[PDB]
Amino acid sequence: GLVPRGSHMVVKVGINGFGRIGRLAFRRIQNVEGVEVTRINDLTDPNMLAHLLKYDTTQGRFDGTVEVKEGGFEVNGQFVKVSAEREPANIDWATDGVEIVLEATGFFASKEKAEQHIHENGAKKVVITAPGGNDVKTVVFNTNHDILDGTETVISGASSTTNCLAPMAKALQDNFGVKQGLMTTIHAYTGDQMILDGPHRGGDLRRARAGAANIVPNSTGAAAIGLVIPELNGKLDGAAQRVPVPTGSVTELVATLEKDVTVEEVNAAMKAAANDSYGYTEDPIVSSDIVGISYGSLFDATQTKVQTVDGNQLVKVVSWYDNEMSYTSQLVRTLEYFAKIAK
Amino acid sequence: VVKVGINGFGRIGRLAFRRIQNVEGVEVTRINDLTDPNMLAHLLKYDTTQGRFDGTVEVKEGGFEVNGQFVKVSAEREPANIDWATDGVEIVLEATGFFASKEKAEQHIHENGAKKVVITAPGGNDVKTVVFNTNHDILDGTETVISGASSTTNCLAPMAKALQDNFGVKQGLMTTIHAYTGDQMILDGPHRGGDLRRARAGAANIVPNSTGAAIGLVIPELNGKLDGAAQRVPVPTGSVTELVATLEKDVTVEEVNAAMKAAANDSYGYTEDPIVSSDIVGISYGSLFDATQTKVQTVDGNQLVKVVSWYDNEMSYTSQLVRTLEYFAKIAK
Amino acid sequence: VKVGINGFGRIGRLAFRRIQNVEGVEVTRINDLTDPNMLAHLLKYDTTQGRFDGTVEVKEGGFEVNGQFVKVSAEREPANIDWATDGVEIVLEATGFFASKEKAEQHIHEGAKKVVITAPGGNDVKTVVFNTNHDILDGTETVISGASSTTNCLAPMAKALQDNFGVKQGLMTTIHAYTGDQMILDGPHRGGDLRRARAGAANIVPNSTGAAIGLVIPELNGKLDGAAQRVPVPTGSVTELVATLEKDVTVEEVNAAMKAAANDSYGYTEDPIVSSDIVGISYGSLFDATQTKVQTVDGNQLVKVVSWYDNEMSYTSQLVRTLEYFAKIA
Amino acid sequence: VVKVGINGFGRIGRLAFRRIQNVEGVEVTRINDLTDPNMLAHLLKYDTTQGRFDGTVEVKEGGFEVNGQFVKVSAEREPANIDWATDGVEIVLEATGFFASKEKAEQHIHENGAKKVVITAPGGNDVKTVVFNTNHDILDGTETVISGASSTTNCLAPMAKALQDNFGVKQGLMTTIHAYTGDQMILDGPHRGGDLRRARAGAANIVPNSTGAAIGLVIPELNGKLDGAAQRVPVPTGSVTELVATLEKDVTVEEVNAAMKAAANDSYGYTEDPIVSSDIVGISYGSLFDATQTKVQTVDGNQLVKVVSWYDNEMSYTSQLVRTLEYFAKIA
Ligand SMILES: NC(=O)c1ccc[n+]([C@@H]2O[C@H](COP(=O)([O-])OP(=O)(O)OC[C@H]3O[C@@H](n4cnc5c(N)ncnc54)[C@H](O)[C@@H]3O)[C@@H](O)[C@H]2O)c1
Ligand SMILES: NC(=O)c1ccc[n+]([C@@H]2O[C@H](COP(=O)([O-])OP(=O)(O)OC[C@H]3O[C@@H](n4cnc5c(N)ncnc54)[C@H](O)[C@@H]3O)[C@@H](O)[C@H]2O)c1
Ligand SMILES: NC(=O)c1ccc[n+]([C@@H]2O[C@H](COP(=O)([O-])OP(=O)(O)OC[C@H]3O[C@@H](n4cnc5c(N)ncnc54)[C@H](O)[C@@H]3O)[C@@H](O)[C@H]2O)c1
Ligand SMILES: NC(=O)c1ccc[n+]([C@@H]2O[C@H](COP(=O)([O-])OP(=O)(O)OC[C@H]3O[C@@H](n4cnc5c(N)ncnc54)[C@H](O)[C@@H]3O)[C@@H](O)[C@H]2O)c1
Ligand SMILES: O=C[C@H](O)COP(=O)(O)O
Ligand SMILES: O=C[C@H](O)COP(=O)(O)O
Ligand SMILES: O=C[C@H](O)COP(=O)(O)O
Ligand SMILES: O=C[C@H](O)COP(=O)(O)O
């Protein structure tokens, strides 16, 4: 009973933080009818942002025309306003008809701080492009977007590893039942790592190190999975290994299950679970092959292991994801759906 | 002074040569590869990941001089045709990567050739496989062909044995996040070994792959209880092994770390510093346990235990290789 | 016209890709040193150039591309390749091992009619950079060269200077992506080069360059020389040229001359781009006006001009353009 | 024993600190940055490109100990508010990259502050700019603010002076193929300095850029005769400078190389080995001439001359910086 809007009824979106996720979100929204970006807020001039939209190291040239103007830029003829406001409270989103804001700066990833966007002359709702705490509904599309009714003011689109892990873990649960599991993500380097050894503003002694020249251990925002799959809460934990590729990642999960299984049964379950969000492949691919994909998670049957020792089984399952575009695809899918049921 | 020969003056061969400079009673008198001495002399002097050679290297005819001492160089394809005895060589380091079996490594042993061979890699189940300070007991000195194992094996072995001896291991799964190597392609192209993943550009990709860690040969009681795989990533050297395992006893994170510290020696290191891969380049430990990455997950009375150890696939292995070579040379009967 | 590819490597595979969108050119036979499954996989998936735009399915003795079967063979000697069996008239020699008239001719026997070498092929072989000197071709030739990637970059930029201002002399530096003939890690280089021996994705590596040109622009013969700096990117390059000219010039005049010279082969841009922005482009050379310098000291001028190129796809685009044109003149 | 302070414990600051351990007249008693001592202690111990610290480092309150000796750490944003005198500091190494001018570097000199300042970068035309063993003659010891030049300047200077003194230089154009640096972005993003190229992912691109060596302050006679640019490329340190020039005299390749060998010293190295960038990481030469890359093109009586020298933008510069600091400290 959610009375969703048609794609002909156009919801106007604002992007706070025109960074990797923000710019890629903007790109995908070009091919979503009924969602449209009318306002961008960052910490720089429009020429910088226009240039970064046109040209993209890992994701290729922009599919269209971009021309700089005063106080903004034009994309395929359509003007988009640019502002440079530090404080989310001072952003006059309503001036440009913006109802929903994509919070993509990485600095306001909580209910309290994201709410600052909602005020007079501001926005109605906010989607955080990251984990946003336990008091915020956290959505991985085609896994738990049921939870949305449309009344919510602040929601989270989860992390990129969460979007990778979730469908793979849920497939295990639903078919076999999961007792417990440990996860390792072999992950591309990101903007919060230092280009060369130097003082990390977050106090992390490992993110302080040269990210494109090191294997760097680190924490992960997907262990936060109980918010997406309630029945698995407290049963999964894990960590990351940040490695020298500018984008593209893979999640390994080692787990104990309720029932006995074979490699063939596991792969078959994953193929059966496949959809627009959760992909399936039996090709021996590498990280560059998943750059720019629209799947939130791509299961790799070639890496599946089922070890049996004295009646006991450890099960290993592995799924690829482009931490940039895979997440962004899921983010926009969640945004689109949320916009149509917004109250 | 036992005189050694190196077949395959590659990454492991050149680094083995370097370490042997500081081992009294071991000395390299003959090198065999597929190239001229100028190429090899240059590759010894200058090293991308391991730094400049600590000494003098000057090219001569049919060889080169290292700190005054001449070392002969030959370019023989077939191990059968290498006249090792001419230069007083008794033991050969087989480091080409093309003769890693008993049958093929034996070809070094003939008249005018060598007496013994150490393979710098896994060499099959009919060859004693040694990780130093873990199972070098098995050597009596009568053996003709031995294996020094793989680099991941030298990393995993002491960490796994420490778990076994203290707590007892039921089963375990391993992932090594591993530097790229010479058998990967620099850019996408046909791999001569038929591997569709090693075919891909190794310095521009996360590349899944099999792993040579053959652990039951080193720790017999764990045979068939451990399996694993690799993720090859863009660093020119330096690696880390993660092991997830179930144990016979209940444990805490503190107990696990304490067991590892107690097990520490020249081969097995210990650290509580939050280090990264570049910090282990050139170390002499075969394995360096990292207490900062230890996990002990407890869910409904059941425990999964995660333990992680660093290793420089190049120098860590080479240090272990030379330690094993030194010891084997002294008991050679 | 039915084409054969010898050496299904970086250039061979990318040539194959471009030929899909050239009507009247079609690849019916591939020869390499491996099984079809390896080659089919390498066609589908490409680190730097992206996934294949189509379907690839492995068969016996070959593979299918969008339904069409393409035969695969594994013959080491070009003399033993029975090209005629598959109606092949022209062969793309892309192995890097037969880059001379003598050795490339070995394809022509009872086999193929003609051969295009995907590299410099000596002074006794017509060397073509498309839209610069493809006028040279009459169609009777048995063996031709498509030049090198740096040659295709430099040529239109250097000719534009000559035609407008006249060139006295010049020195060139290409800051170049690493290539397959470099070692992944320090090791013995089969060609004897002590620098290509070194880890190519972890070093700035000085090296020689195959663009030292008089074969493409006769009037500039012996007036240009240069070198390379190989650097850690898997593809994408840039050529810098410092030169003395016959006439006095300004920065504006130079850029204007380059824009006037622009076409399908020679691009023009005033955007401050980087190497990743030129990966996969179809221009053989893309002049960058932002890097132009004209230094004047005591009446004398040094002139600096810079052009981008994807050593892989830029060259391949030029190669296929030259192949298409050469095929049509029987 | 002259007591030194480091403002900005970054790449140059930390490496300067390392080299000062083996300089007897010089000692670091105070470090100022924007972080806690644990972060700085860790970054001193472990170094991606330059290797582990040769010694012992242990964290304390308000500082850390190095081989037993305590060094104080503070976190003051404004150079005016740094009480250098408290720790006996006379000379400050300004290594933040944010105070590279006479005006802004002078802010270190006040009551309870420092006496003198060495900027680890170009610092404008009103500040004596020194490349050691090329023009450190210029120093008399009365100066309040000096510059140690840039890394490319320290590379280029001895190579260019050798050309001038032997053959005479008419004009020249320079290209440095340079390692990426901290002021580039790790991934595509808004550059705080407004540069659209430094905005791009530095470890995944060839990135054109300006250069801080484009030299008349170091070699007066060459002023306005040289200009150039950079190509930033994916290595975490290590660089090479190419110079193409016209000369007053005719020359051969052998004569050029011979002139460079004759000019060699502790600052200016010479080599005939075909080396690559990793081979110069951590060297103490400010500039290392490579004879293998020399070219002398002759066309119709006219000559273009190409000369190339290696440098570790990090340690080569730092070696020169400390040599200049040592000498400057001695003549106060
Ligand atoms: N990159 C990924 O792989 C990835 C994946 C999933 C989620 N995320 C999340 O998305 C968010 C951003 O990630 P990213 O990698 O795109 O970040 P980024 O660093 O690339 O971009 C952040 C942008 O925010 C801007 N910004 C910073 N402070 C601001 C302020 N006060 N006001 C306005 N703008 C400001 C910056 O100028 C920059 O343009 C984070 O929450 C991150 O956790 C990132
Ligand atoms: N590099 C590592 O991380 C590592 C660690 C442990 C073990 N290993 C093992 O050590 C061996 C060598 O590895 P690498 O990376 O040092 O090899 P590499 O590719 O660097 O060197 C192989 C060398 O052997 C030479 N060679 C090849 N065929 C030959 C022949 N028929 N006769 C004489 N010389 C020949 C080559 O010229 C080359 O110098 C392999 O078995 C490998 O599995 C490697
Ligand atoms: N990639 C570039 O940057 C570039 C640009 C312009 C020109 N070229 C030239 O193109 C040629 C190929 O370069 P590449 O980069 O594609 O190299 P590559 O190494 O990727 O391709 C060579 C291919 O030929 C095959 N091959 C080798 N020997 C053979 C034989 N005897 N018979 C049949 N097949 C054989 C190999 O298996 C490999 O797949 C070279 O001449 C090179 O100089 C390269
Ligand atoms: N790295 C090189 O290649 C190189 C070579 C020659 C010269 N330089 C010069 O050295 C200077 C610094 O270079 P870098 O690459 O080491 O920088 P960096 O980014 O490594 O270090 C800068 C340090 O200064 C600190 N800092 C910033 N603002 C500060 C303030 N207000 N007060 C105290 N500390 C502050 C930072 O936290 C950081 O630790 C620049 O002027 C640069 O031109 C660098
Ligand atoms: O920082 C951004 C990451 O891409 C998302 O976090 P994660 O790797 O833990 O999922
Ligand atoms: O060839 C590579 C080294 O021997 C180590 O590889 P590994 O993971 O099989 O031990
Ligand atoms: O063109 C072939 C290789 O890419 C090398 O290029 P180059 O000879 O133009 O320098
Ligand atoms: O940004 C820091 C540079 O290293 C400064 O030195 P440079 O101008 O000589 O390149």
Residue numbers in the entry:
A (entry chain D): -7 to 215, 217 to 336
B (entry chain C): 2 to 214, 217 to 336
C (entry chain A): 3 to 112, 114 to 215, 218 to 335
D (entry chain B): 2 to 215, 218 to 335
The authors write:
GAPDH plays a key role in glycolysis and gluconeogenesis by catalyzing the reversible oxidative phosphorylation of D-glyceraldehyde 3-phosphate (D-G3H) to the energy-rich intermediate glyceraldehyde 1,3-bisphosphate (1,3-BPG). Recent studies suggest that GBS GAPDH is a major virulence factor and a potential vaccine candidate. GBS GAPDH exists as a tetramer. Each GAPDH subunit is composed of two domains, and consists of 13 helices and 2 β-sheets of 9 and 8 strands.
We prepared the ternary complex of GBS GAPDH by co-crystallization of an active site mutant C152S enzyme with NAD+ and the substrate D-G3H. In the present complex, the C3-phosphate of the substrate binds at the ‘new Pi’ site in all four subunits. The phosphate group of the substrate forms hydrogen bonds with Ser151 OG, Thr153 OG, Gly213 (backbone N atom) and Thr212 OG. There is some difference in the orientation of the glyceraldehyde moiety in different subunits. In subunits B and D, a rotation around the C3-O1P bond allows the formation of a hydrogen bond between Ser152 OG and the hydroxyl oxygen O2 of the substrate. Substrate binding to the holo enzyme induces much smaller changes. The main difference is the movement of loop 211–215 that moves towards the phosphate group of the substrate in the ‘new Pi’ site. One difference between holo-enzyme and ternary complex are the observed interactions of Arg235. In the ternary complex the residue moves closer to the ‘new Pi’ site where the substrate phosphate group is bound (4.6 Å distance), which leads to disruption of the salt bridge with Asp184 while hydrogen bonds with side chains of Thr182 and Gln185 remain. Modeling of a cysteine residue in place of Ser152 in the structure of the ternary complex shows that the SG atom remains at a similar distance (3.6 Å) from His179 NE2 in all four subunits.
